[PDB]
Design a protein around this ligand. Structure first.
Ligand SMILES: *[B]([O])([O])[C]([C]C1=[C]OC2=[C][C]=[C][C]=C12)[N]C(=O)[C]1[C][C]2[C][C][C]1O2
Ligand SMILES: *[B]([O])([O])[C]([C]C1=[C]OC2=[C][C]=[C][C]=C12)[N]C(=O)[C]1[C][C]2[C][C][C]1O2
Ligand code: NA
Ligand code: NA
Ligand code: NA
Lengths: 213, 229, 232, 214, 199, 240, 203, 235, 223
């Protein structure tokens, strides 16, 4: 029988710092045991202070992404201001829940700045449950990346260690390492790592190579 | 559509559109109904404007079912609407009860349709009065149904042009124990009171209803009745 | 007898023109926008001593940072007040935030020419609302006061008077309003202008007063507070 | 469509310096029966866009009607605007996703090739609304045979000439005829350049069977 | 069922077997599966009898009113599209394949396949459960430029060959020749069928 | 008066005044002409320019209704554009149903019956528009039809709608178009428009030219700028 | 999940764990399973995270609408009834949501249990979630209606810590609230494994 | 008088008086000017204040990144028509991932606003728009009217005393295509000024500016943002 | 059920058995399976008894309306067309297998109509569970242009083959001969199974049934 879903892979990750937010993803799009494209990044710029990472069934990623874009415009026209990171997160939960009985097969992680200029991460499940996090991993390799983040960013399971805050430099190297490790062990993560950095100045992008097999 | 009634009460409590529909009936060609002891006769003036009219193409005396028949005075096109609806209603009754519709039941269902057109939005009433005949309880039935949706069971009656005089002639020439053949003679005689010109079997139409059901008399049968005058 | 969506030779809908005329029969209301907050004041117009003045609600709370003063056909306003309250709570549910005073005013204004006979739903609006509204509240743009009429036109005002004596009260507001005036001075000027245009002698039961300040939620003045302000 | 009927196999596509080339055999199979060995699975959309389709032929013919009428509608305006390859690709994603979401898909996988404003366009759309761009595409079983050869050449030489791309596509059609049991030795090659859309065919590959003696 | 249609210069030949069967039971052994859609347009019925008859009737009704509004007999392409549209719109609920063939003043004799809502013009076409066993035969025996008599002979031999191999085909063969001149209906009885190897 | 407010009301003498008033709006409008020749149909419109602030080509009165069909209008322009959309959707529907280009007589019959439907009820008003449909096919030849606000559709050799309908008609009658080509007829169309144009009353105007014939491959398209300028220079020089 | 609530002399105690699981994977170590509707109205959450968050936020919006309309807060019986009707409207749809609506109104302290079936029970002790049986055992053993505030906080924190030890789908932190006459107070957000280590060290 | 109250009623002169009455709504509203160069489309408007204590009504609205409008007439009808335009633009980016061609949006306005002019109980939109846009065919200035008719303009003015603005625009339209943005805005402001009486002048309170072009998304300048443009001339 | 039809020289002959079974238990020994449509149009029914009853009733009713309006004798192709299109809309869920036989201005016609909406014009046909027994007798001895007596004999033999051979068929043979001068309804034209008598002496002496309660309600007051 016809199945309306397919798993296309991809791993996303977001880190919130004191004055920054990183949203990173690999660029591989897969189907079965084959590669559709090696240049399919999963980060989508929403506003100058908010980006979203999307992973899962790509038909839903494309659709949900276009719905968010139309909704931001609709809000700007009605309220004469851009949607804040928090407002985008609350609205996205309702768009996902509107499909509770035919879900969007998308793992979403929002990364941007709150109204105090501090870094904000918001992670969801396909049907809309969410909360704000300091860091989060999503997508195929989420189970591989998350325990490292718990340890290195949350300082868990460490005794007699300085709880020094996360600098942008330190976070960038950690995102690069976890995506190198994820590409080594997850068949659906590979080709390149797109990193999006949000600050008061704006959004910078980096692309770093990952394993091609 | 127009969702408001076109028939409304006047300050004197009259439904003026039903009174004007009755004027259309009063202007219509004469129609007679006579309920004999063993049957019913329906006779009408089927007079046409020219010889060029093919007389046997359209009919005024119409069958509804095997045992029910109709005639009218007033608007011909409105009449056809009621005949189609009456034939339909009689088939619905038959599908449900598996028994031919009693004449009083058919009259009541057709009278309801006529009443609707006096209250429903954006419609005028029918400019027709019907004369429905039938045979169902081993006995004959003759009913009149007028534009308001009211019905009356008659022993004998007249409608259309010169109806008040036709009813007086019937009043003195009617007996409850008359037989169907004698009642056909009496029916043609009531029409002859208001008929202008020579009455032939082509400018009058007769329908009968007895134990054998409802049927129209052929022009040959009408000729044999006109021979008697 | 023409339809409700007929234009006049001057280019205005007759029904809207007449709904504006209906507000000239409502009790007068005043609103003053100040850097320290917005104040709303209205005359209750009490017809009998047996009537409970606490049951005359011409200043209502839309949300904690937004208040509404009304004039005209008060039963018509009850529908718009509830639609405004529902919009704030629908916006809060979806976006997890408060609405701007301007967005709430616009939301209510979207219902303005939503009347008509042909091509409409079973029980749709047959005529406009015979109401004038004064929205007063604080948002990220500071204290703001907005006016709205049956035509749906909404605009920001530093000082505005609506109702039967709106022409006279606007003259007094124009001569007394200073942009840098304090909230205490705006409250007193409102009470002075209201005493002037009012038929009865104003007291703590005859009128209604409310403030929305940056730092303070929507506050309806009590009898004790109204009496303490009447003194000056 | 819940169950496809007459279906078409792999559709290829590769960008070159100055345009795009797509290829598709002229077979409509009814299961294993090569029922129609002379049907075109390629469509000229407009002067900038061309489309090839794998999957149900009846669903492709429907899309060809809807697309063709949209192009006629646009050309009636004559307002200096015309659908870019990228806009047709975008429309087709929405159209496929919408049908998928109603649980009544259009049973196809398509390759859209285009040339507009000096840039080569190559895009994929499947029956679920999965869409993307790449320098080379291969639908169906060609994703397993033809795409490794298209990628092998594009790794060594990322930008090919129209002739280099054409020879590579012809070599892929030969490998597909040998290894895909739902193919036929009759195909078309469609090219889009500044000059427009040209569809060539019916073509055949010269087969070699000398391994039958090894 | 075995249905077949062949284009020639100036018209078409259509043929069918005559067996209607409910499993192993032959319900009707003399059924004519060639139905007129218009004066010079016919269709060949296969698949579900109820669906095939329903589609044929709606197509004939649609084409009659079309022909009257256009003040001309419908084109065979208009008839083929009319059939194709019904078959495609209701593809998940209809199980019939109606082959549409006939003659026009614009394109002449043309044969069209509508299988599953598709549309294709063919030099010849075969359909039905019996067509499976004669694919190689029609590919080996078809020659371009056949005369009306050669087309009838080809259709008869191919259908007789399928009737002998297919349990679901049998009876007599019905032939129809549509040209500008009119339509010729012909019947080849079950005793007068062409003989081939049958062991 | 009294009997003239609704299209569902006949006057005592058997007339429908709302339809006649819709026709007055066409008569009060600028002139458009259509001429059927040996190898196609040519359209010409006297498009009065109400303001020098408008672009050349604004408020076009010639439309592409199908790839092979052209439409020329006179009357209330919003009503005219609405009718072009009805004709477009009707032509598109025929192609979806039958797989080929709608025959022009059929398109005219179909569109004229939408127009007719607006002449029977109080719920809607008749179109304040008269339009022509031109086409060219190899199997059908050249065809020119004209539909008026009542819903009437007839086939023509020469046709004119608007202000100088009768003035343009006596000029068209002077042509033996049955034996003329589109290329020669364009000059004649521009000439007749210049004759009927009232320079005093309707100051300036833009000549609009369309054609569909053997030359265009049975496609309805604008007459190219060069041929339009030759016909425009010829129209002015014949006027002297 | 493990959620518990009990009425006592000094009001209502309300405690929750913080674990979210995607099968056997711990998708979130610390989620807030309590919604603060107003200063006198709380809702504990268990079941499908998205269902809990959406429906309890929809109850919150309706409670807010009631306050704007009547210038008074909704009662605990009316709020629990509103949610119960929302669940009845979607019965058979596959919602999963267990909640305890805990508050203080004109009738004193209120505690209601509401299900995705529409079950709505008033009572003075409830526990929901995969670890509810473990919380009931501890809570029932140490319960007295006359517990002091600190004795009640110990019972709540212990019932949740002990449930997290036995139930693999419960863990993280204990989020405890105390519903007093003048509104709720968030008592603590304490790591459940640190509490269990502390209990073990006292043996 | 009897052909006065319904859009479905044609007068004996072939006129629809209800459409002509709706046209008056545009004439009553304040003047607005729209003009264009080879790279920019500019909208300039006179904002009307109901009192000294009231703000000046928003005349310029944002439709999409490439389109903006200036209104004259019933504001509720202007809001309704603006929302229609915004949705039509959104659908085009959702479906085609490309901005809606400005001339195609104007055609949709013409079809949409014609429907109520032919149906009983319905009424024309009592609003006129000036539409500034930029697409593959460069910048545009379009005009829409209650009659459902629409115009492609080199420049245009609508509203109270707008004939004065049209006289200025007709004279300087030769200069417009080669103007730089400041020279183009200045021309629009001078045309707007002509509508105003000799006593009052353009201030940073009653002036609204809207600009879209080759390098600029639709931007609205209103109070302090208007000052750079208002320093060019003094009557 | 065994229902059969046959076209002879001057008309048509419809035949039917008289058994109704409720899953291997004979409920009715004497049911009428030949239904009236119009004076010269009759219909044999098989399949779901209620569906055959209501579909024949519905078309007879539609045919009376058709004949009343037209003023003409109804055509056999009209009853088939109405039946077909009604059955097609129900996708076989109205389980009526019908044999429509009749005489109109175009002569005698015989049709088989199936539950899904398919039909067939035939010189002879058989439907029901006993259709193959009837069809074997018809194929064995049918010849075109049979005399009334020769065709009636073949029809009785065909229905009888089904009665004896099929467990779902039994009772008597009913027949209907339709000609240009009307229809002769031959109910119980043959009884293949002669009176099965017995010494069924099963009398109960009054009082053998023990009664607990008794109430008499008289009706003579109303009479
Ligand atoms: B063939 O594909 O085997 C055949 C076609 C057929 C037979 O009878 C008719 C009548 C009208 C149109 C087509 C037709 N099909 C069958 O015999 C089948 C048996 C029954 C179930 C499907 C169909 O009808
Ligand atoms: B519990 O029942 O195990 C838990 C409830 C839960 C988790 O996260 C939240 C957030 C807000 C309210 C309640 C809540 N559920 C889970 O651990 C699962 C995670 C998600 C998918 C199944 C279930 O809900
Ligand atoms: Na990898
Ligand atoms: Na690999
Ligand atoms: Na066989």
């Amino acid at each position: 029988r016809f199945s309306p879903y397919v798993f296309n892979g991809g791993t996303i990750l977001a880190i919130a710092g004191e004055d920054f937010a990183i949203v990173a993803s690999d660029t591989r799009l897969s189907e079965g045991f084959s590669i559709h494209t090696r240049d399919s990044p999963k980060c989508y710029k929403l506003t100058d202070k908010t980006v979203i990472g999307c992973s899962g069934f790509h038909g839903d990623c494309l659709t949900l992404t276009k719905i968010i874009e139309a909704r931001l415009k609709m809000y700007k026209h009605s309220n004469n201001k851009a949607m804040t990171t928090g407002a985008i997160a609350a609205m996205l939960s309702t768009i996902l829940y509107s499909r509770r009985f035919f879900p969007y097969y998308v793992y979403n992680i929002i990364g941007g700045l709150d109204e105090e200029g501090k870094g904000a991460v918001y992670s969801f499940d396909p049907v809309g449950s969410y909360q704000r996090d300091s860091f989060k991993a999503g997508g195929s390799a989420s189970a591989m990346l998350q325990p490292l983040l718990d340890n290195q960013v949350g300082f868990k399971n460490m005794q007699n260690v300085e709880h020094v805050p996360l600098s942008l430099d330190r976070a960038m190297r950690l995102v690069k390492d976890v995506f190198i490790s994820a590409a080594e062990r997850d068949v659906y993560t590979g080709d390149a790592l797109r990193i999006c950095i949000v600050t008061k100045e704006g959004i910078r992008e980096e692309t770093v190579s990952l394993r091609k097999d | 559509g127009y969702s408001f009634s076109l028939t409304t009460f006047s300050p004197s409590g009259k439904l003026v559109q039903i009174e004007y529909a009755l004027a259309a009936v009063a202007g219509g060609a004469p129609s007679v109904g006579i309920k004999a002891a063993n049957g019913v006769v329906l006779a009408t003036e089927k007079k046409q404007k020219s010889i060029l009219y093919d007389e046997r193409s359209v009919h005024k005396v119409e069958p509804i079912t095997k045992h029910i028949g109709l005639v009218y005075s007033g608007m011909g096109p409105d009449y056809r609407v009621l005949v189609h609806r009456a034939r339909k209603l009689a088939q619905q009754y038959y599908l449900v009860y598996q028994e031919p519709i009693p004449t009083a039941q058919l009259v009541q269902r057709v009278a309801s349709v006529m009443q609707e057109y006096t209250q429903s939005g954006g419609v005028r009433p029918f400019g027709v009065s019907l004369l429905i005949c039938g045979w169902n309880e081993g006995r004959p039935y003759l009913f009149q149904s007028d534009p308001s949706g009211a019905y009356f069971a008659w022993k004998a009656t007249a409608m259309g042009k010169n109806y008040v005089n036709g009813k007086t002639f019937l009043e003195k020439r009617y007996n409850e124990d008359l037989e169907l053949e004698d009642a056909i003679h009496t029916a043609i005689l009531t029409l002859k009171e208001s008929f202008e010109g020579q009455m032939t079997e082509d400018n009058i139409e007769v329908g009968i209803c007895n134990e054998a059901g409802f049927r129209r008399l052929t022009p040959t049968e009408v000729k044999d009745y006109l021979a008697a005058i | 007898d023409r339809g409700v969506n007929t234009f006049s030779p001057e280019g205005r809908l007759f029904q809207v023109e007449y709904a504006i005329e209906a507000i000239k029969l409502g009790s007068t209301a005043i609103g003053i926008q100040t850097s320290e907050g917005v104040c709303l004041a209205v005359e209750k117009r009490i017809t009998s001593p047996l009537m409970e003045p606490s049951s005359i609600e011409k200043i209502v709370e839309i949300d904690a940072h937004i208040g509404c003063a009304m004039s005209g056909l008060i039963a018509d306003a009850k529908t718009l007040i509830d639609k405004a309250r529902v919009e704030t709570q629908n916006h809060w549910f979806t976006y997890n935030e408060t609405m701007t005073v301007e967005s709430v005013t616009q939301a209510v204004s979207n219902l303005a020419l939503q009347f008509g006979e042909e091509d409409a739903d079973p029980g749709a609006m047959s005529r406009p609302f015979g109401v004038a509204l004064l929205f007063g509240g604080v948002d990220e743009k500071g204290p703001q006061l907005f006016h709205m009429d049956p035509s749906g036109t909404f605009v920001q005002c530093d000082a505005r008077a609506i109702g039967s004596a709106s022409e006279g009260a606007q003259s007094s507001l124009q001569e007394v309003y200073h942009k840098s005036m304090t909230l205490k001075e705006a409250i007193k000027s409102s009470l002075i202008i209201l005493k002037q245009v009012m038929e009865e002698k104003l007291n703590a039961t005859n009128i209604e007063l409310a403030t929305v300040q940056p730092g303070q939620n929507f506050h309806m003045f009590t009898k004790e507070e109204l009496e303490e302000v009447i003194k000056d | 469509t819940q169950n496809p009927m007459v279906t078409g196999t792999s559709v290829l596509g590769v960008k070159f310096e100055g345009g795009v080339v797509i290829a598709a055999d002229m077979l409509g199979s009814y299961g294993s029966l090569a029922r129609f060995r002379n049907i075109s699975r390629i469509m000229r959309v407009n002067n900038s866009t061309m489309l090839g389709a794998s999957g149900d032929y009846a669903d492709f013919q429907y899309l060809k009607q809807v697309l063709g009428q949209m192009v006629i509608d646009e050309e009636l305006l004559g307002d200096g605007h015309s659908y870019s390859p990228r806009a047709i690709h975008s429309w087709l994603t929405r159209a496929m996703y919408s049908r998928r979401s109603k649980m009544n898909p259009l049973w196809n996988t398509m390759v859209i090739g285009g040339y507009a404003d000096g840039e080569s366009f190559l895009g994929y759309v499947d029956m679920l609304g999965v869409a993307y761009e790449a320098p080379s595409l291969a639908t169906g079983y060609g994703a397993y045979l033809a795409q490794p050869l298209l990628r092998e050449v594009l790794e060594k030489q990322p930008v090919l000439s129209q002739t280099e791309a054409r020879d590579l596509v012809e070599r892929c059609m030969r490998v597909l005829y040998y290894r895909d049991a739902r193919s036929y030795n009759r195909f078309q090659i469609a090219t889009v350049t500044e000059k427009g859309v040209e569809i060539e065919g019916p073509l055949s590959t010269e087969t070699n069977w000398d391994i039958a003696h090894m | 069922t075995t249905i077949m249609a062949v284009e020639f210069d100036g018209g078409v030949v259509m043929g069918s077997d005559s067996r209607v069967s409910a499993g192993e039971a032959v319900v009707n052994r003399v059924f004519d599966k060639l139905s007129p859609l218009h004066e010079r347009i016919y269709c060949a019925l296969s698949g579900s009898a109820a669906d095939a008859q329903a589609v044929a009737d709606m197509a004939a009704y649609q084409l009659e009113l079309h022909g009257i509004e256009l003040e001309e007999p419908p084109l065979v392409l208009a008839a083929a599209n009319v059939v194709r549209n019904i078959s495609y719109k209701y593809r998940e609920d209809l199980s019939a394949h109606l082959m549409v063939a006939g003659w026009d003043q614009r394109e002449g004799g043309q044969v069209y396949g509508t299988l599953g809502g598709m549309l294709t013009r063919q030099p010849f076409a075969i359909g039905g459960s019996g067509s499976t066993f004669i694919y190689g035969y029609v590919d080996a025996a078809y020659k371009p430029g056949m005369s009306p008599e050669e087309c009838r002979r080809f259709t008869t031999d191919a259908i007789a060959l399928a009737m002998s191999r297919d349990g679901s085909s049998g009876g007599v063969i019905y032939l129809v020749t549509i040209t500008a001149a009119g339509v010729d209906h012909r019947v080849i009885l079950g005793n007068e069928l062409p003989k081939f190897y049958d062991e | 008066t009294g009997y003239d407010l609704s299209a569902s009301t006949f006057s005592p003498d058997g007339r429908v005044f709302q339809v006649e008033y819709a026709m007055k709006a066409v008569e009060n409008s600028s002139t458009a002409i259509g001429i059927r020749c040996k190898d196609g149909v040519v359209f010409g419109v006297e498009k009065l320019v109400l303001s020098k602030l408008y672009e050349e080509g604004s408020n076009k009165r010639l439309f592409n209704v199908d790839r092979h069909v052209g439409m020329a209008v006179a009357g209330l322009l919003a009503d005219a554009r609405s009718l072009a959309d009805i004709a477009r959707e009707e032509a598109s529907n025929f192609r979806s149903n039958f797989g080929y280009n709608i025959p022009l007589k059929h398109l005219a019959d179909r569109v004229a019956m939408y127009v007719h439907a607006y002449t029977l009820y109080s719920a809607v008003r008749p179109f304040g528009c008269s339009f022509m449909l031109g086409s060219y096919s190899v199997n059908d030849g050249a065809q020119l039809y004209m539909i008026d606000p009542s819903g009437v559709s007839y086939g023509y050799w020469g046709c004119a709608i608007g202000k100088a309908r009768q003035a343009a008609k006596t000029e068209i009658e002077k042509l033996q178009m049955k034996e003329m080509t589109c290329r020669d007829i364009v000059k004649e169309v521009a000439k007749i428009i210049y004759i009927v144009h009232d320079e005093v009353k309707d100051k300036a105007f833009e000549l609009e030219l369309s054609w569909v014939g053997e030359l265009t491959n049975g496609r309805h398209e604008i007459v190219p700028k060069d041929i339009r300028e030759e016909a425009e220079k010829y129209a002015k020089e014949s006027l002297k | 999940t493990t959620t518990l609530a009990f009425k006592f002399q000094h009001g209502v105690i309300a405690a929750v764990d913080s674990r979210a699981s995607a099968g056997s994977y711990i998708s979130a170590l610390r989620v807030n399973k309590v919604i603060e509707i107003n200063p006198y109205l709380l809702g504990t959450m268990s079941g499908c995270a998205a269902d809990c968050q959406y429906w309890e936020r929809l109850l919150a919006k309706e409670c807010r609408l009631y306050y704007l309309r009547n210038g008074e807060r909704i009662s605990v019986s009316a709020a629990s009834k509103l949610l119960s009707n929302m669940m009845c409207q979607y019965r058979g749809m596959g919602l999963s949501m267990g909640s305890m609506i805990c508050g203080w109104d004109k009738k004193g302290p209120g505690l209601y249990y509401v299900d995705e079936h529409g079950t709505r029970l008033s009572g003075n002790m409830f526990s929901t979630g995969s670890g509810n049986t473990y919380a009931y055992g501890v809570m029932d053993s140490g319960y007295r209606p006359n517990l002091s505030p600190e004795e009640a906080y110990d019972l709540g924190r212990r019932a949740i810590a002990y449930a997290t030890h036995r139930d693999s789908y419960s863990g993280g932190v204990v989020n405890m609230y105390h519903m007093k006459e003048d509104g709720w107070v968030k008592v603590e957000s304490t790591d459940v494994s640190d509490l269990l280590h502390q209990y073990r060290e006292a043996n | 008088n009897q052909y006065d109250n319904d859009v479905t009623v044609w007068s004996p002169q072939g006129r629809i008086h209800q459409i002509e009455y709706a046209m008056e709504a545009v004439k009553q509203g304040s003047a607005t000017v729209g003009l264009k160069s080879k790279t920019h489309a500019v909208l300039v408007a006179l904002k009307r204040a109901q009192s000294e204590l009231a703000a000046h009504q928003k005349k310029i609205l944002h439709v999409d990144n490439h389109i903006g409008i200036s209104i004259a007439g019933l504001t509720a009808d202007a809001r309704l028509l603006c929302n229609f335009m915004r949705q039509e633009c959104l659908d085009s980016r959702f479906v085609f991932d490309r901005p809606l061609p400005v001339s195609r949006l104007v055609s949709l306005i013409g079809s949409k606003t014609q429907i109520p002019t032919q149906r009983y109980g319905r009424r024309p939109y009592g609003v006129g728009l000036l539409i500034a846009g930029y697409d593959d065919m460069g910048p545009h200035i379009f005009q829409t009217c209650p009659s459902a008719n629409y115009f492609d303009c080199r420049a245009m003015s609508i509203g109270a005393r707008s004939q004065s603005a049209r006289t200025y625009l007709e004279r300087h339209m030769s200069e417009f295509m080669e103007c730089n943005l400041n020279e183009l805005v200045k021309h629009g402001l001078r045309a707007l000024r002509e509508t105003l009486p000799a006593e009052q002048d353009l201030t940073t309170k009653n002036v609204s500016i809207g600009i879209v072009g080759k390098d600029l998304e639709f931007t609205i300048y209103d109070d302090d943002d208007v000052s750079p443009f208002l320093e060019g001339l003094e009557e | 059920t065994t229902i059969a039809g046959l076209v002879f020289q001057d008309g048509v002959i419809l035949g039917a058995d008289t058994r109704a079974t409720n899953d291997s238990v004979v409920a009715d020994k004497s049911c009428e399976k030949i239904h009236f449509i119009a004076p010269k149009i009759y219909c044999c029914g098989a399949g779901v008894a209620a569906d055959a009853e209501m579909t024949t009733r519905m078309v007879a009713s539609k045919m009376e309306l058709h004949a009343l309006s037209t003023g003409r004798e109804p055509r056999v192709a009209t009853v088939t067309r109405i039946l077909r299109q009604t059955l097609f809309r129900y996708q076989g869920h109205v389980g009526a297998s019908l044999i429509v036989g009749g005489v109109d201005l175009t002569g005698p016609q015989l049709y088989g109509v199936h539950p899904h909406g398919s039909y067939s014009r035939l010189p002879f046909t058989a439907l029901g569970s006993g259709q193959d027994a009837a069809l074997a007798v018809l194929e064995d001895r049918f010849q075109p242009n049979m005399t009334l007596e020769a065709a009636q004999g073949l029809l009785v033999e065909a229905v009888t083959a089904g009665i004896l051979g099929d467990l779902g068929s039994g009772g008597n043979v009913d027949a209907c001969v339709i000609t240009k001068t009307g229809a002769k309804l031959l109910r119980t034209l043959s009884s293949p199974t002669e009176p099965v008598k017995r010494s069924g002496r099963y009398h109960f002496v009054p009082g053998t049934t023990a009664v607990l309660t008794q109430t008499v309600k008289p009706l003579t007051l109303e009479l």
